[model samples]
Target: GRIAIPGLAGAGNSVLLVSNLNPERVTPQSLFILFGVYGDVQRVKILFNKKENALVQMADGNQAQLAMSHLNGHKLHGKPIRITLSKHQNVQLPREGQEDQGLTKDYGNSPLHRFKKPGSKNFQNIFPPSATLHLSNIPPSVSEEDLKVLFSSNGGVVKGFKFFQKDRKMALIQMGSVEEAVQALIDLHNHDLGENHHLRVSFSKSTI
Candidate 1:
């Protein structure tokens, strides 16, 4: 087979994957965690050569955008993960490789790339330790860039964020200063951002 493009325009973003694949033979039982990468859980494919790589499909445009912002440039398993968005998909794998000496591969019981609240052992940090307040009910038209601008304008930096796809009408917002985020909640809360949509905002519980 021709040398596969590591990063191509059409092929979806690639990650340096660490896996639980058996070295004696590759099989479907292989479990993968992308080091320095986070993928759309809805559309993820894992492949094994002598090493591993992945093709992640996000739930939607906004989900993809948010994933890139939050996970890209973060670290995992003592290694930094690199995240990227792609316009293409690849579905091929080759079968010839070197002999194996299996390694235990245990890092922890926790998982990577699956959507869940951040935990104390979350591989990458989400927000600064200085945060206390939360925000929710974000508008869908509020793009990732807009969220960044919105939070930055309030006198503190954003900690992290997540949005829902099925509803396309809500999001989680974390800020460095609980007080400032509260200010944003009051100042910009329940506001409108065009298209006849009224924004919603409120304090939220802490999550991972």
Candidate 2:
């Protein structure tokens, strides 16, 4: 059995009810990445009964407040997310072999990313391959310096690097030349960083 909320509505104001999620792509991991931006997530419960709904618990009331305000109407995976306070104080795992009803767990200090799903539009390169490569779907914990190190290790000199101000998961890296950039892209396009995230690289016209 899944954890039952015995009390009346809004008993667990710290929990968030997230609906309208894409069941196929919105996993606990994706929720963690999106909600984690507002605050640390204490626990996540994906409701099997309601495949498009989930309960996410922030570490505290303030974190919950932040997440609700910022993410309530945000679009994720081509769907608009609907968020509100939940009735349960917390989420718990289902009893016995009923893993399908729901799952509850804490993901502590772990970074997450969104790799291109097969046949998704993201898999198609928006920018061409060139000396200035645009990188997206990156792990938030990774920095420009970290990418510089990665490329430099492959004998490519990073001439310049700039990250998108509003979106931390994207960046632009300017390699020494077209040859160096092409080589770097070929070698590291699918380089896996933990959690199924691979580097999404394509050439861009922007110099910075």
Candidate 3:
């Protein structure tokens, strides 16, 4: 008779076992983006099971609990996710040339992150919500079209777009109104533009 495996009870308080995912549609970066909304994800690993599964490790027990409670049974991409405590507290990365067994993306300071914790920034430094947004810290490879796609993703209507003649890294985008600009700033501020460059968005006083 085969020995029965013990349950994962009392183990991995900071880790969550995610199941019933579409492997083809899932990646470490996507998982980090999804789970990072609740808390910082320290590690993620995919598993080969009857159902597509993943193991995600949060920064702490509280974060793990929060993610599990909020994301468990939550539908993503038309599939409901199943989450539970894991048997291991941490995941071990595969040896070089072995396989992709660990999270590769940096979630700690990801540029695409838009949300921020309280007291993280000075209130005065933040721009007042406005119809035009000033953009800076852009990568050279990023074109106006790239920014347009990003702006529209969050319901921004581009009335005008122009780059600073002196600095190609800087630009100004005018929206249909102040509300549209505010919405775009809320979603795109600190957006990652590749090569470790992060897009900085702020309300602009100028219209064009």
Separate clash counts for every candidate: 7, 1, 1
Which lDDT tens digits does candidate 1 get at residues 63-161?
455555644544222334355666543322232232211222221222323343334253233332234434445555668778778767777577877
Q: Could you tell me every candidate's TM-score relative to the true structure?
A: 0.33, 0.49, 0.53
lDDT of 1 at 41: 40
Cα misplacement distance, residue 197 of candidate 3 (Å): 2.7
lDDT of 3: 0.67
Ten contiguous residues with the weakest lDDT in model 3: 117-126
Residue by residue across 76-178, what tens digits does model 2's lDDT show? 4467778887766766655645663236655533444232223555334444336788887788767777888878976777888888988777887888877
**Rank by TM-score, descending?**
3, 2, 1
Model 3 over residues 51-141: C-alpha lDDT tens digits?
4887777776766766677667764445777888776677666655365444333344554543344354422234445677788888877
Superposed Cα deviation of residue 43, candidate 3 (Å) = 1.7
Residue pairs in steric clash, candidate 1?
10-88, 36-80, 36-81, 36-82, 43-57, 117-208, 118-208
Q: Kindly report the root-mean-square deviation of model 1 from the true structure over all alpha carbons.
A: 16.0
